[PDB]
Symmetry: D2
Subunit: 394 residues, 4 copies
Amino acid sequence: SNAMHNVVITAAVRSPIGTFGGALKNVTPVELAVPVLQEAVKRGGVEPHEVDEVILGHCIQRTDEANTARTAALAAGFPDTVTGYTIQRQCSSGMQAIMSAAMQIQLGVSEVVVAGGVEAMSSSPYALKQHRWGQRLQHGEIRDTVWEVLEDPIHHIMMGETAENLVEQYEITREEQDEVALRSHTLALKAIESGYFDDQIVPITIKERRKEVVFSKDEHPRADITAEKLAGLKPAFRKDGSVTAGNASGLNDGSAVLVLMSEEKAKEKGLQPLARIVGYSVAGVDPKIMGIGPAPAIRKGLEKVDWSLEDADLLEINEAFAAQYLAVEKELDLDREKVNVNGSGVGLGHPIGCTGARITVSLIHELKRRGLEKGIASLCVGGGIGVALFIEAL
Amino acid sequence: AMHNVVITAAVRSPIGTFGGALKNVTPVELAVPVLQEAVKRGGVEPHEVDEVILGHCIQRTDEANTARTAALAAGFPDTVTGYTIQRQCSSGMQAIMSAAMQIQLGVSEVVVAGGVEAMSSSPYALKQHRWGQRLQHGEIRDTVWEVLEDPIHHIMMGETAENLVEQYEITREEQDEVALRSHTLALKAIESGYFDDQIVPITIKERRKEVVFSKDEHPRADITAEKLAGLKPAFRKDGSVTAGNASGLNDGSAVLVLMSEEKAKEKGLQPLARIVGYSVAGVDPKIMGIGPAPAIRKGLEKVDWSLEDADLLEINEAFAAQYLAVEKELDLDREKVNVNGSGVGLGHPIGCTGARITVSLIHELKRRGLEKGIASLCVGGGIGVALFIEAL
Amino acid sequence: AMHNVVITAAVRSPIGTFGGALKNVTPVELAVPVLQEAVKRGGVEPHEVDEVILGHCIQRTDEANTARTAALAAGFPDTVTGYTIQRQCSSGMQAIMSAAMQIQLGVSEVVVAGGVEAMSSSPYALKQHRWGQRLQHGEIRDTVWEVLEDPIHHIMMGETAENLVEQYEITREEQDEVALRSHTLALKAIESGYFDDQIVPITIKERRKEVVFSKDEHPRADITAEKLAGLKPAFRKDGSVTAGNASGLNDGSAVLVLMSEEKAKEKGLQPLARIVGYSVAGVDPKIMGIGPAPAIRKGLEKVDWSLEDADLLEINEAFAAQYLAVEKELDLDREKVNVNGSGVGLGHPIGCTGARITVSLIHELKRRGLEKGIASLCVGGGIGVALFIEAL
Amino acid sequence: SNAMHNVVITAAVRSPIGTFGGALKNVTPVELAVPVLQEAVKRGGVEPHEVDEVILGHCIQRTDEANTARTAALAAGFPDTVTGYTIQRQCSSGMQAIMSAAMQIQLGVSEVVVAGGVEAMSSSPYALKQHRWGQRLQHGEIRDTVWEVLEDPIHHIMMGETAENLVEQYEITREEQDEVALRSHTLALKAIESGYFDDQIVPITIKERRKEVVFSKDEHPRADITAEKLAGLKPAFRKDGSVTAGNASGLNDGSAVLVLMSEEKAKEKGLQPLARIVGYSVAGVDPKIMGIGPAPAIRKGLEKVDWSLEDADLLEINEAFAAQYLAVEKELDLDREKVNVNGSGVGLGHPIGCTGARITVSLIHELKRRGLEKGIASLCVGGGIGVALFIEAL
Ligand SMILES: [K+]
Ligand SMILES: [K+]
Ligand SMILES: [K+]
Ligand SMILES: [K+]
Ligand SMILES: [K+]
Ligand SMILES: [K+]
């Protein structure tokens, strides 16, 4: 009679997503997480002291903000009792944070967990590898941590090259990629104008040197992205290639946070949750085609939760590259009309640590807006991993 | 679902000193041979491993996701996924706990979990290089020195130890007594061969040769009370915490193979130990060293043990003063604690240590023919973590 | 041998502010167009130039030997050799003196000489990168901030100015009076077109456009007594030296064509000026600003002038306080000194300035129809240099 | 009746030459100049207050020791009245310093000048060019100042490549280069053993962290350099090339200083000078074959002083590369038995700022040892310059 508690989600919020060198240029990951943590708890039906753990996914962790989760909890003014830990599973980090929170709740390790992800790519440092013991002679390299994290650590090829591998494998055309890219911006712009993201977005106040900036709207979507402009871009990873800056996701800044608790705890509190978690799955694939990860992850997960793919009402499949998304779409034979319905990574941006949580936030709110139930959120991961999360809106 | 968790292998590298044997080894490189040996001993083939989970404090973007990269570098199949955990000093212990959670829920059947830190090879960082320093001198930041500084209060871990010194009225002399004990017991354990079975030798390919690193290099054979008493305070002007009574900066990895009891029985394996419980407690970061006290008390309640039921404890010595605060607060029996030394004598490769002390505890329980163990450690940022095990 | 030295051209770039118009221009790039224009005006073809000598404070190993590299980059024949001089703030004036020495001895017949500084594009340095920092944080050093710090006493030039303030009992208010004058007279000179002939416009190729930089950008049209009086001391807590009464950090080049009087006559050229003498004096580095006093006195003896014989003087304002010490020590007639502004109003691109003030003095003597000029400046490290000229 | 004073040299001393990362690893240029300045003045027949100027040639100047000459004068304890300035003419910097001193003395600008050169290559810094205004994105370069100074700033080829240009032009063989290289070490070792350098060398005391090291002997010459070892080395600048690390000069540390004064001042003081300067010359050539500089410089200078080449009793022609030396030897048809008779740059090292002064120090002492009169010292210069100095031992 050992019990496994159902996991429900009582709040789901995010910062707007900044562009590289944009509104969040001078914000650290802890600074970017803090206001979102604060608003999540305010909406989530709990006081800070009731939070058992903060778990954050973070790709480019910083030693000056060791343990991003614990540091952000304290910086947010939460009691010293609110512990935290930080997760690195590359692009899926923010989704793994939610899964790890669910595990703690299912087991009764925690009753309430605040979980999500953050990435502040714009403020990420440069590194010197030979400074400690010396370069001795000849020129050295000062390494961009953002550019490093985009390079596979075993094969030393960029994520964009792994995308071109999928282009060749799945015979994906430049037109197909650019159609998806245009769609991503177009649907994002429409959602923004229609106010679809108003509820889920937490404005960030940036204290600059001589003023304060209130950042409240996603800044990656571009009205000037047209079929014409996309077709004129040069290939970014291979000569005679088709993956470009225009049909690839951006480098971006953002945070996203959910409040999760046992269903019994929500009943105790008299709270109507937004959604429940019904399952999650992780699958490993060839790092050289890491973008295909969501296919086996989704298949594995559907088997576990006893859904057909057709049962899903909406899906969020992160667009790391349009080509990568297209490979997943072709492999699973997805109905695009149910997928990324307000855009995805190409139009909205890809703050990597954040994204796995960001797409979950967006999915929850869009299911509710449409009055639909079943959602799948899934994304590829550098290093060759796919992760999928299965939810039901309440 | 709802499985019990057992441990079928528990191994570690020897612990290198800063700039020592492992000077030029990266965290992935240091994890790989220990991952391979653990799986070999743990009764499984690599394809049977569901997840590798590693605790790592100073993660590197050139080895993104240390656990997954190490799994691949170790030659494990692409199906063997991984993720990496940062809970500061307790990272390696949290990795074990996270593995246990997956196994308890039936998320995974077999998990390889532990921790690694390669402090000697950690980089330097420039924070103003991207957008420009503009004018005046800047700082090139040591990632090791950063990770030892509290990120909210901007004081070194050693200063948080001096806070405990003042709070618990701990003498310089008792700190040095504990430091001497740490080296002395470590040296005795090394001499007696207690660590022979748990240590995995590391081969380092140098310019003109290969070196085989097989023995812990931090313990000092000629350390003495007189030497310790002569040292200058390291963190406060009239202070008592010194380089001699503080843990070192060190390099090391440590790995366990965990699986469900069901899976062990199905494979006909006799596990070394089972996990009975685990607990985490948050405290004031300014006295982060006390973390193990509430964590242990919290965990004892959960597993329904009395403190006295424990046969052996490992409480990491981040600083002798910090250990002493815990000893005093819980009124521990020193003769059952850190019986073969701890961080001061053996070193503290931070990401690794939470797993390292668990490895050591498992093997010492077995050596003594004892059952119940507690492993626990403080965590920069104000956290205590505790793991409760029973040797089989 | 034993020739008289005349000057047939004297030109300069406009002076940019730090991070301003010349932000992305290197010293060679900034010297080139001014070298080319000087030679064009100076009555010679490039192949007739025997040597290019440039004063340069923050030399770069990627442009080794600034003078020779600039000569080549300017398209001058391979036969046109060069060398580069560091005598701190007086570097550009020393280049002129060294040119004169070569011409006097018949070592060279025609020399192009001057100075350059591109402070905005100067690099940062790491001193421990080669052999390693090992542990703890390091410094990434601003070469501009380094060059402004005395290398023996490790105090900023601004602090040496505060030493003169105390020594000569100079008020904050008189410093600000001089600072206001410097901007005011510079602005008037700019408005009246006094600098039109001497300035060589610089074209900067930016990402999407070309910019033509033709006017000095340091003078502040809206500077006032009230604004200056409100500023905080920059170098001492109860101090009087401020950012407003100190020279700026700036970018600029300045170049003269010199030759023997014999050579000028042979070429039928009418020179702008002749060099009558020059002098160098060493003083206490802690009050380096006073250098011009002994240098001027020493030189006056050599050329057999009285101070009163001078029609105009240029005494570089490194700091208003430093200028004031010189004015007081020599009992100068302010109405004959820095008549169109100086370093506070116009800027101080250090390698360039010793040549820049000479260019300016030559043209202002001519404009006023006056003969005798003295140009002089202080030098970090405790040196004063003075140049004595007669307009023709 | 304007007078031009004869220039005489009353002292000529040098540090031993350190190897890269060797005995002088942790010594700055000012530190390395100081003891040599001090000993020079002690031998030169003047008190420090009588010194009018210190002039030093220095290739890799440092902003933390601005104006190396003035800084070293003050650090040596010389009075504040002793001014100084620093010269950059690449490899000939140290020789130009002596020439500039001679000019001041000839003109009566100074009566006594201390002049020479210094280079501390081992302690030279690394530079970042994009740190001030930012790298923005992607990896950058941390630049070795030593490696930069060895690269031509117009053509961006290493000095070693300009040497290979001369190899091809003058049809110089690998054997010829290696014979010169072996000779350079062999003659240096012999001179050292015979005590030829005892008088001219000033020992340097290096204060290391836990001891003091007294460095008193040139450390570049190698007894293990053999014809066999040289022939086995790989080409360093061109595939199928012949310039190697073994037949090229090293990277080295050293200082060298002369005391110069008017002949009348020496007579006044009752001093017997070591030597007089009779002339000097500078010639510009193609930077791509900079190594040939000494040929036109020597020819130009001989015309000025009315010497035949045959009149010279000894020559020092710096060996930047054996190949470069060989081109000069072939062009001028030199008698090698009169040239570099105790070795040169390949065996002894090449601390670049120092070398032009170093070879002059060595020449003066060897002329005196052999009881000979006429000397020529000359060297090539990166950027395409040759410089020559003509002296008579007294
Ligand atoms: K919400
Ligand atoms: K084992
Ligand atoms: K976990
Ligand atoms: K002119
Ligand atoms: K000169
Ligand atoms: K001598």
